[PDB]
Design a protein around this motif. Sequence first.
Motif: not given
Ligand SMILES: CCCCCCCCOCCOCCOCCOCCOCCO
Lengths: 238, 708
Positions: B458-460, B500-502, B652-655
């Motif tokens: 799922m995660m990009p 990301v985590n930082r 944007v992708y990880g958070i």
């Molecule tokens: C401490 C553990 C770390 C966990 C961090 C994960 C929590 C984040 O959850 C949110 C879900 O992420 C969604 C990603 O969004 C996708 C980005 O959309 C792509 C659009 O980019 C535009 C390109 O032109």
Amino acid sequence: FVAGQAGPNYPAPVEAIKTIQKAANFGRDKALEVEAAGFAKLAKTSASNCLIGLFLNDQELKKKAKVYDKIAKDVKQAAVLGAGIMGGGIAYQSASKGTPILMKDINEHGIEQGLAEAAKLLVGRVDKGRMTPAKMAEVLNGIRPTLSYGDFGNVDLVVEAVVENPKVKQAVLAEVENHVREDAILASNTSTISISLLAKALKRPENFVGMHFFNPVHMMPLVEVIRGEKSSDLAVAT
Amino acid sequence: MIYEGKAITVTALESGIVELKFDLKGESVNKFNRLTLNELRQAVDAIKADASVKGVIVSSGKDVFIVGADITEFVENFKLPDAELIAGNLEANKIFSDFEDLNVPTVAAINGIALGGGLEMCLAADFRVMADSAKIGLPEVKLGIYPGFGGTVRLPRLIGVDNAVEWIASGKENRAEDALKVSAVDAVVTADKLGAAALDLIKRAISGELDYKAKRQPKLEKLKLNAIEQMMAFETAKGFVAGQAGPNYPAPVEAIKTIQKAANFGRDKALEVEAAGFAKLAKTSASNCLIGLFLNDQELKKKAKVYDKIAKDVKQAAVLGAGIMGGGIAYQSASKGTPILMKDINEHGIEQGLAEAAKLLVGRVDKGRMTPAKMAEVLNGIRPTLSYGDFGNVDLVVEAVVENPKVKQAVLAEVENHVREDAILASNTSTISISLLAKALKRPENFVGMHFFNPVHMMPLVEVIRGEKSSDLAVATTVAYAKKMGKNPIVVNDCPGFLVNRVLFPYFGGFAKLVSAGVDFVRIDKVMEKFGWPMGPAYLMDVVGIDTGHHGRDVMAEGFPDRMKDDRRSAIDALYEAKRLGQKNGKGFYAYEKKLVDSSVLEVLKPIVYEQRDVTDEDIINWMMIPLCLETVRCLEDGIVETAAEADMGLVYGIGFPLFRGGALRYIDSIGVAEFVALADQYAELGALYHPTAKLREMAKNGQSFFG
Ligand SMILES: CCCCCCCCOCCOCCOCCOCCOCCO
Ligand SMILES: NC(=O)c1ccc[n+]([C@@H]2O[C@H](COP(=O)([O-])OP(=O)(O)OC[C@H]3O[C@@H](n4cnc5c(N)ncnc54)[C@H](O)[C@@H]3O)[C@@H](O)[C@H]2O)c1
Ligand SMILES: NC(=O)c1ccc[n+]([C@@H]2O[C@H](COP(=O)([O-])OP(=O)(O)OC[C@H]3O[C@@H](n4cnc5c(N)ncnc54)[C@H](O)[C@@H]3O)[C@@H](O)[C@H]2O)c1
Ligand SMILES: CCCCCCCCOCCOCCOCCOCCOCCO
Ligand SMILES: [Zn+2]
């Protein structure tokens, strides 16, 4: 419909229809008479007693089956040397019947063909509602491709299905023997080579037998377990 | 020829038929930049003046038909005052309308991609013939705007409201097959017959066999729908699009409002309604932030090309450890055309790995999203094992074993003696130092970090971590492999919490300070969710697991004591000590049966609430956002990430950073560096996490920005 499917040599199917057709406008008792007459007739046919004889044969085979099973060691983990036509077919069969199997080969291309075919068959059945997508997953996960003997350590029975060449087979067979337990059974799928000949390249011939399948492995019912002069009853039974 | 420009040519053919071909000399594609529009004006006027013309075929000389103009011009154009922008669009639309008003049949021969302006040109013609391999669509919404060259006017009158809304609000590309079914196009043929099909069709229009005037008429008048059916269509569209795009994305709903306002109008008035809404959207903060994301992506793509110059393709991969991450990595790798070995230490481990890979594959097939034959290819791509017998030709090995330095250093050192000495080794660790792990190896130059996020499929985002010894080749190869796996890799130099985590923890710190200040956590994440966050802090903490957050905190506290070490127990400690581990545990800030508010938490958190400080929703946002943004700035300044684009896209992708806000650094740019620094000082009492940096204060005065 029944005629062109059973053949002219099988009276039973058509007679049953003729009996139902003759009794169509009858109540129970008269319909029973029509049934009895046709029954008596069939019971005396040559097709019938020959068919019943097959049943008697099967019974005999099942009695010998029980004897074999008294010593036969279940095959929890199997392995097949060589993918492709026979090798891949054997992998498919083994995995399809609840027995994990390693598909060993010498080059990626060989494993491709093996996995490709195992797929076409599994996909074919799902594409015909005869098989669950989840089941197809179980089968495929059962087949484990490889090009080394690193996982042969716990294999209970290895089926050699390499090129029809005595020299090649004797080399491979001798090689795998040093990668499996010393109580592991080794078998060759060869159709024109002597099992007793191949066994001379081994240091544990008592565990070597022949396991002859027929092309296409997934279709043909018969398997000839060949006993070499050194083949132990355990190797054969297993 | 009738007309010869540098972007367009009009060549005469048989029977008075004329061909207007798009071929921007010197460029790889056709696009409606200033030059092309101007030439279209001239080409149209030339045809309009040549009384011998009996029909027009519009084609392309490139691999694509016509795509959008350079994002660069979008930025410029949208800076102009509303009056100018609208006047410029009125002028452009006049060209297309004049082409549409030609008193001669017209046909667009779509050979390849026709997006935005490109499609709009096609909609201006009487007929459209499309190659079965081409794609068309209106991606305007992706930039926070909507069709500006008649798209909202012509598409609805051609394929119906519902379908036009679907295309415009989604901005999806549509295959030939689908385009024919909704009648966006009139015929679909092979690439080799496109020319003949267009020529054949035009002749039938000229002979009168096909009534081109009647086929054109619909886009010159009101929609056919009833006032009643219109209400049903527009109101449900707004309703459906609303709960799917969210309140923070104006574009989708405005497009619907525009089509609704023009419902009973002909072309010209409907264009006016379109122009006004367009101008409005082009000035929204959402639009330029979305456009900024596009600029970031372009930057990433340029760095991509550099990485690829040396990156060694990964033909055979391997992952150590099955289970959650391991199995997830195997699935991904195999799902994207890369054979992978799934190594573990016990059959049970491989069971879980194969089990999950199956559920996903089966899940897709059980929803017609995947072929049974394809599921076979994927599964055959994953090869379970408990030895290193087949590692001999592995190009890259990803270690995804238990989070234990000891364990990882042992395994990593072990596998190194089973792979080629030029094979890349990577750890999926999230809290251990890559440079530390590398010391157990004899070839650290080939060791990097390849950090994925749960659930792997799922995660990009994928953080490629460069250790002090990590070679450019090792990094480049890992980057390309991540991209091949369908992920978005961003290189980050080794440091606690990486990128990301930082950045997330300073964010959670602020959340911790709010809860300790008596602020209701249910109100808090309701505010952050309104701000744009997918999930609020409290809820996110639960999903991630309090135990996980507890551990993470400790790591960061050790990593940056000067600002991440807190001398007081927070709500994390209270929930962890109280065994409220999160969603998985069934209880965290919320209770899960799924997400419920249960007062039993009040007791647990009571001991944490120090002061009963009153706060506004705006403060809540700042308590949360200032720490996150500043920590991002620190990462940039520390060189953890090379550019602002990388840092922002990383979040944007990880958070899941609110897209319409562009990123942490772009958020500061939106507020204004000077303004942001001032704002930060206002909360200086909250701690070191809210203290601007010297470099920041400096650029705050020099009128500098991260993207400006
Ligand atoms: C401490 C553990 C770390 C966990 C961090 C994960 C929590 C984040 O959850 C949110 C879900 O992420 C969604 C990603 O969004 C996708 C980005 O959309 C792509 C659009 O980019 C535009 C390109 O032109
Ligand atoms: N006509 C038939 O189809 C048929 C019928 C019955 C029995 N058989 C028996 O099957 C065997 C041949 O099988 P086939 O029909 O698949 O032939 P095949 O050539 O199609 O398959 C041979 C496979 O074995 C692989 N191989 C070669 N040397 C190897 C080694 N040392 N270790 C592992 N793999 C190795 C090859 O790469 C290839 O993939 C023979 O013993 C033959 O008598 C064949
Ligand atoms: N929250 C997450 O799930 C997450 C997110 C990002 C990164 N990670 C990272 O992933 C790693 C842990 O992954 P996980 O959560 O799937 O753990 P897990 O416990 O679910 O899976 C571990 C698997 O590795 C196997 N294993 C143990 N020792 C091994 C060895 N020496 N060689 C090969 N296999 C071995 C185990 O038998 C088990 O199957 C950690 O480094 C962690 O930081 C986890
Ligand atoms: C007119 C409607 C537009 C629809 C909106 C979609 C956005 C499409 O616009 C794309 C413009 O991209 C601009 C990037 O141009 C920079 C060139 O990059 C240099 C690298 O060269 C590589 C060429 O393959
Ligand atoms: Zn603690």
